[PDB]
Design a binder for this molecule. Structure first.
Ligand SMILES: Cn1cc(-c2ccc3c(c2)CCN3C(=O)Cc2cccc(C(F)(F)F)c2)c2c(N)ncnc21
Length: 248
């Protein structure tokens, strides 16, 4: 139907539903289009449709721009048309910059700040992200940082304990992810294995001595954001207003 009639597929961008890059025939722009298999049960399906109505009202510099949502009968599919972001995500970005010198403090903090501001926005709306990790943080063609796909529903490396264990949870889950991301932005790794060895240590509040001495302030921030107890993690607003971000 509409998808095949109105768009030309270009390439698959990810699966987990699926996300395609596709060109709209009429306006000639390329878009990221997510196809989601709709639940068969009436109640579960209504939950998804309610979430679409909420998200579609969102407008913020850190949130990917929304264009359209529609259904198609195969089982029913929900299609979501978003602005196409760059192929290089934040994971790639850090992979191409494995030395301190390639990670200018200022640039790194400005990246993180945009993420935290998008998160603060969602929390203020009574929403949470739940899936914050570098492979799911994007750049626009004009280099604006975007939190990635969320709502309407991989590595657990950035996932809070309570979220991993299926315990009751709040917006505080996003703060835990932010903590690990801030550390990772400021601490380049030589190899993939070193990355995993170190991050699993950070999760458990064991930091590289070089980091604690190079970044004493970000260090206590990260420590707080990574409290195993969610009540103890700072509000996104508190993080955004931290002194470390005062040099603009
Ligand atoms: C791999 N990959 C994934 C995406 C991508 C990024 C963000 C999002 C999606 C895919 C699907 C939904 N969504 C959201 O943020 C959530 C959202 C926001 C506003 C309205 C709605 C809706 F009203 F409910 F519809 C949903 C991507 C990309 N844009 N460019 C390149 N590559 C991308």
């Amino acid at each position: 139907g509409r998808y095949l009639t109105d768009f030309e597929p270009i390439q698959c961008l990810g699966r987990g539903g699926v996300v395609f890059e596709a060109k709209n025939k009429v306006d000639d722009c390329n878009y990221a289009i997510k196809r989601i298999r709709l639940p068969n049960r009436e109640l579960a399906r209504e939950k998804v449709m309610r979430e679409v109505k909420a998200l579609a009202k969102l407008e913020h510099p850190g949130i990917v721009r929304y264009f359209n949502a529609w259904l198609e009968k195969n089982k029913v599919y929900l299609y979501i048309q978003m602005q196409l972001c760059r192929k290089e995500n934040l994971k790639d970005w850090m992979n191409g910059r494995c030395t301190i010198e390639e990670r200018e403090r200022s640039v790194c903090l400005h990246i993180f700040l945009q993420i935290a501001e998008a998160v603060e926005f969602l929390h203020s709306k009574g929403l949470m992200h739940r899936d914050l990790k570098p492979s799911n943080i994007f750049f626009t063609m004009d280099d604006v940082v975007k939190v990635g796909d969320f709502g309407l529903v991989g590595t657990k490396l950035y996932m809070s304990p309570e979220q991993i264990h299926g315990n009751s949870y709040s917006h505080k889950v996003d703060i835990f992810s932010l903590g690990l991301i801030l550390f990772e932005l400021l601490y380049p790794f030589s190899t993939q294995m070193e990355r995993v060895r170190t991050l699993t240590d950070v999760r458990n509040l064991k930091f590289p001595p070089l980091f604690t001495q190079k970044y004493p302030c970000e260090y206590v921030m990260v420590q707080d954001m990574l409290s195993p107890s969610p009540m103890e993690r700072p509000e996104a607003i508190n993080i955004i207003e931290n002194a470390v971000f005062e040099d603009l």
